[PDB]
Amino acid sequence: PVEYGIFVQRGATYTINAAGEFEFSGRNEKWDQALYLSEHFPALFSDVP
Amino acid sequence: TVTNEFASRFRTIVATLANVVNERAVQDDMQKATRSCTKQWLRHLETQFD
Amino acid sequence: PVEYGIFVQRGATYTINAAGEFEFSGRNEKWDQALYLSEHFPALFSDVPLAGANTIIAIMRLFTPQGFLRTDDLAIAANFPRASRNPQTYIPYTNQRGTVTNEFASRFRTIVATLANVVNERAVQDDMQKATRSCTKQWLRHLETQFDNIAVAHTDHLSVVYATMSNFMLNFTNNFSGNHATFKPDQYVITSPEGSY
Amino acid sequence: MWHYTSINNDTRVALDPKPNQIRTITKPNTVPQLGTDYLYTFNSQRRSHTLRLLGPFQYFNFSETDRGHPLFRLPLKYPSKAIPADELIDNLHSWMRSVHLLHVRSEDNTLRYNWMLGVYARSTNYTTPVGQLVVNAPAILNYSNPQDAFNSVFVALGIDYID
Amino acid sequence: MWHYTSINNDTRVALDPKPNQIRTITKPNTVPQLGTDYLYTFNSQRRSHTLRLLGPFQYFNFSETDRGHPLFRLPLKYPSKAIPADELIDNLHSWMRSVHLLHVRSEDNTLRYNWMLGVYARSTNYTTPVGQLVVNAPAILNYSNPQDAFNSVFVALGIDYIDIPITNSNIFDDSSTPYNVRIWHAPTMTEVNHILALMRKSTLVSTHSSWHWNVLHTFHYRSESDMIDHFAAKILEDWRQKEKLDKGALVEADRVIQRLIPLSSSTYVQRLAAIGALYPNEFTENVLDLSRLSTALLQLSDTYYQHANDQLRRLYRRMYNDSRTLYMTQRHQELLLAQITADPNILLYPYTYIFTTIPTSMNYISNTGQGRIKHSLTVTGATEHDTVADIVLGQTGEDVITISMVEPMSIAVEDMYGYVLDTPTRDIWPADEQIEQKGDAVALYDTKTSRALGMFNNTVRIDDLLSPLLSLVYRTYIKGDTMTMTQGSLDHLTLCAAVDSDITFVGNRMIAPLPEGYIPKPMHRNNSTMKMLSLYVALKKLENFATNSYLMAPDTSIILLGAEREPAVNILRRFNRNVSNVRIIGMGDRAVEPNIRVRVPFPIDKNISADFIICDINSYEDQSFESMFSETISVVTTCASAATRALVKINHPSEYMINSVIERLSQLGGVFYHTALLKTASQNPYSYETYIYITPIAAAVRFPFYSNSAMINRYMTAVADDEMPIIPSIHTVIKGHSNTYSPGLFCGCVDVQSAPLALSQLKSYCSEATTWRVDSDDNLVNIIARIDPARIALEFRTRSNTSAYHEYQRYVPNGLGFKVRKTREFRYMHREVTFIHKLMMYALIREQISLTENMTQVVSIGGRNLADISVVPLNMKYVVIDPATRIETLTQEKKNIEVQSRPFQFDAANMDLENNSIYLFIAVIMNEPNGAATPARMQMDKIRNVATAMLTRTNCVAYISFYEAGIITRLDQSTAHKTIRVEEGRLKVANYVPVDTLVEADVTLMLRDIGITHEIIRPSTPELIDACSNYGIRLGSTGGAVLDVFNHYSPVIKLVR
Amino acid sequence: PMSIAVEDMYGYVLDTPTRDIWPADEQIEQKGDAVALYDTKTSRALGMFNNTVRIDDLLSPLLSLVYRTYIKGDTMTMTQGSLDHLTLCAAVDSDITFVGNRMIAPLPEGYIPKPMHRNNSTMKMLSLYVALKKLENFATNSYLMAPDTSIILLGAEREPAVNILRRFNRNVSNVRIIGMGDRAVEPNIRVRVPFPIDKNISADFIICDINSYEDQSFESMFSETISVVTTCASAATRALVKINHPSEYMINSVIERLSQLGGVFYHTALLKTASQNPYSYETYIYITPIAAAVRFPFYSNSAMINRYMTAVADDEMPIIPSIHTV
């Protein structure tokens, strides 16, 4: 629960900017596949510590 | 829980009613057998509720 | 109900910290035998005194074993395999020859006296008829006489069977230190660096 | 003497112990004392028995099991004289020793136990979802930023509030 | 004192009785006694029952039949009171008589019974083979050579060993035994070697360096925890023993090294045994909490290795791996050589390693009892810190420590009733002066007083200041502890203020005990209560001043005024209950019965009258100055006409207001009234409101009018402040050597390892810093530390940053304190009035020195402990000239101080004063350097010589503080004397010899004949607020009364060039 | 164990200075003898006796009996400020209230206060407090502080003496009884010699019991104890500071230091209390300014000094009491 609250506080998703850096949403939002074609990525798979 | 709190509350209720029925029976000089029988019945209720 | 309230509020189980103090779970929960291999112990068997639950603790002291921790001498002279660095078995009861009275049996008389005053206190709580109470007592006394009969056969005969059997070649593990409060079996595993142990 | 001057600080936060002190906040060893651990008054001309606890216990939701303790049956042993201090102290000590809030002691000096939620989880025997959170993650009660102490629970459980 | 000296003897052998005494060792006849046969303690706060037996029975394995005895069921008859001694003694006697060890008495004088084995055979009912040996041959227990006592049993039975269980020394603790001893066959040294070699093959096993009965025996543990506890115990015993061997004492110990050797063990025990022979601990006489010893000793080890130089570290590792070896000092081995030469057949542990050189580690403080340490951090030390990282302090719970706003007063009961009074000084009141005073007063009332002043006035309420005291007088009464006090005494009055009930006396001194079952409620005093009581006392003492019983005369009346005065009336009434015919009336707005309610102006038809009057009426909060003027004038008129002995409050005691009061009374009565300006110690310390005593007298008053009075100055100088008042911060971060810190505290906590560092950084700001741990388990040291500005003035003169960091390292982890109980600390601590005065002076002089230009140096004369250093700005050089100050040259070099440890030469010719320098003779001229008081003429000689020496220098400035004579005449009138009091005419500051005082007119007279320019000056209110807010200090209750007078009559003389 | 009267342990003897001058030719001799003594250390037998015959153990049976008669209520009457009062305060760790001038308030039923835990130097510090009260007056019967006066004990682990003095003066208004020294716990402030330069202690009484550092150059201990004496002398009009190494040179140089400190000589004396360990050569030095110019300010061939000077390191290892059987 605690690691989860930390992670989700960082954001449930992220976008990559032109410089290549990750940019997390800061928000908990349920994923939809509608997003797969958008700029967003699930944040669980970012592999950013 | 190892123990069901609702059931345990019924055990306390029944303990109270038991000392109540008992206090009555001693007030009315009731025979020991019938008193033991009311108590066995109350205990049975406790097990059933549990 | 009240002694139980206190006791289980202390914790259903406990573990032993490196300081060796028992630390109780502080939580009601049923035991499962899975836990037997864990760091956890049932808390009834802690023998750690607790105010206001003395009756439970006493009824618990009745469970403490009457034997001793024999060394496996002959299995050592034989170089019989033994996992422990010092092999030992708990014989359930010592031999008792010289005495007019069998100490194991007498311990059963004390246990039974306790249970007797316990069952009695219950029967008066439940206004039970005198006849049935006298019958439970006669039954307990009978148990005492029976135990006094067989006690010599246990302490003075069966114990030696145990004491040989401790040295049988394949009885290789340590089973019990004789102290319920702090005994966990040593746990060996066959660990490959590749697959799971 | 015009301007208002004041130091603001959160008492409900200040009153909440660091996790290492939770094991001993019951004061298992020493006996409770008036004006410190607790305070009592028998109000005469009205025959009432006010026992208020002090320190962290001043905010404490009792378990029904706590209400099964003799300490609460105590006023019933009266009216009308004030309860003897010896019986009061022995009982209240026994009860105090009875509580065992779930926690996990840590080395960090920034942390404090979220006393309210852990007491509350004890109060419901950890049946409520916040309760079973408190069972499977006692660490969730420890916190440095006071606000995130609750946010971690609201996010772990997904809930909009806790009554 | 080099060599170890000791007598070795086997106690386990000495304790074993000769066979003839075994029949009577049970003491069949005589009853057992405490401190002889046994000892018992019921440990309170823990509800435990320790019964330890003494004599041979201290080592006794009980039979289960022995455990069937009532004596062991005894603790069960409790909790919680200690077991009655009669039942204890009867039972223990019965049990003792129950034992009957098998033996055969003989005539030979060499023999003794082998108590251990016979007791053990009893314990198993002689079922065990050693047991049946003891049955068929009791003689086998008797022995002359101690060793053969066991060898005879090992050979008769053929066994290689015997495992004897040991019981807990306490016999009421029926629980699993930690381990068991095991006697081995031995007897040659070789057999011992072999056994010990074979013991490496066993599991949890250890041995002492030598053995009782000279029979090798090893301990075998149930678990590593039990083993660790045994090791820690024995380590503490060897430490405690070698501590007295090093001190050269003869020691009767059984063996030279009391540490165990782990023949086979867990790693924790190896690290214990390793740390054990290092002997890290400093000698200590404090009681230890043994219950946690293991933890302590482990943590110590963990830190010892953690901050030891690489070679000592490796030495520790060597001992840690070669744990089977017994490490020992050369002197130990010398002792072993001696005891071997005496007894060649003695067996000693063979694998040992002698230290050619003892390790030179820092000794560790290691008190593990209760109590916070109160460090006083040194400014500098051997360690040279450079760019140390900021140390965050963790937040603490209220459970560990609470931070209340103001430290409650801790004065004597009588102390709160004292008052000081300022007499009028000027003989006339010219109208040209009146315009000035009326103007200053009007402007003051319009702009209001200082915001900081009123913040302190409202924060430091007197009621809360006196609460702990009054409540204690209440609490000792209700539990009946009080019983004797004089009627009319201050303790009587205070008892009346503590308790809301009538307080009858039976006889002149005894108080009537309260009827059983009846506990009176506390008296509910509002803030102004104690003050009114203090004024009642003030009137009783102004009436007589030889009084001891402050009690109304029969048939006399007093009438308190002001809002909500009811409690003071109920208290005065109950206090005077035994006096016949006393009227104690009350008035004022918002009054409840008994008090009559009225508003100012009093109704014109009304006609109050009494032998005493006490007005405490407040000024209306919003009205024109002329309005308050007519109002308080009318109040004073009413109070003066009503009673011969009025005491009326002046809320706005301007020179103009009070002098106009004198004018009003003068035109009212013709002859002037004998007015005085009283200030009681039950007033809120910062209150500028001051009472004015008023009485007709037959003598025509000379100098009726006030000017430049102390009580007046306290109000006049509280001008509305330039800047919003400072609020005491609680800093958490500890930056290293950073100047930026607002006044306040460092409350917080940090891991014990960072504790030496935190203390080392705190010293830059804090003079002293209390620290502790909650428990041996918790790793965080809590710290509270006031920020003292003086330390900031010292530590920031140069960029150097040094500390006694290693000395602080010596504390980890047990040396920093321990305390389970909650501690309360305060944003505003109490300090003595004289100290607050010195601070006000230092502020006055600091604020003066900052303004002046081109001053190369400040030279404080007689400034012990650099006391004046706060005054001097961080860049300017600071010279001290005092014989008493003691400094290493490197320290003055470190902080740009320049000490000259010679007495200052007050002879005018050789007094070498520099140009562009600021001399500081604060509080020094009155005393000779040795501390003896100088005659006042000598002080005048001092000031003469210093001004005459200043006559040639340019840009020179000097501040010569000196006591004024006027204070004496005031102190002779006043009853307050908590810290300032006359002694045959010389005022006595606390911890100082009373000193003769100078007359200011004579001082300015000689100063003007000398012709040097000069200015008499005193610290004012803004200086008070600056000192108090900056140091985190609140003024005392008595301090509030005495401070205005004490400060006004201790002028600084500012000579200048 | 000792079997003396209760008052007997509080007594002290004092040796006055005898010689009117301190010639430098003598100073070289004394400085030499003192240096050599400090370097070779004192007699091994001496220190064995000093460590074997601890005063705490010597007085234990007595203090424990005063404790035991109190808890069973046998005691009840004693003067406040009396030596029996003080010793009762040292026997028992609890406040001791009086009801009336002579009666002691009986302990509440069911409450038995624990024994006071004194370390070895406790009784000595109490003996020095009494020593100061008697040096102040010598006609005194009530050894009790005057109201509004302060005393400040120094040295390591002085806390019990402070708790005892405090509980003993509980009925006196406004008494500061401060404690200092290394390894101090609250109430006592902790400090190390030299005292921090910013620090400024002051009191009407001072009692230094600070130990010399165990391993330092003689000049080092010299500057240290000189600085200690300076601090104690400046702090209070009536100091009593321990000298661990009371050589003729050390003490006379102390007199020189005070003489250049205050101008006129202080009225020094060499006190030795009965609560000291009997073989201790450490001796206290009373120090006070007086209006009279001291004649014969300096010591020579003094008793307290001789006790130390003559404990030269011994020729032969000390004898150990045998228990002969044949």
Curated annotation (Swiss-Prot), chain B:
It is found in: Virion. Homodecamer; each decamer is made up of two conformers of VP2, called VP2A and VP2B. 12 homodecamers assemble to form an icosahedral capsid. Belongs to the turreted BTV-fold inner capsid family. Inner capsid protein that self-assembles to form an icosahedral capsid with a T=2 symmetry, which consists of 120 copies of VP2, with channels at each of its five-fold vertices. This capsid constitutes the innermost concentric layer of the viral mature particle. This is Inner capsid protein VP1. It comes from Bombyx mori cytoplasmic polyhedrosis virus.
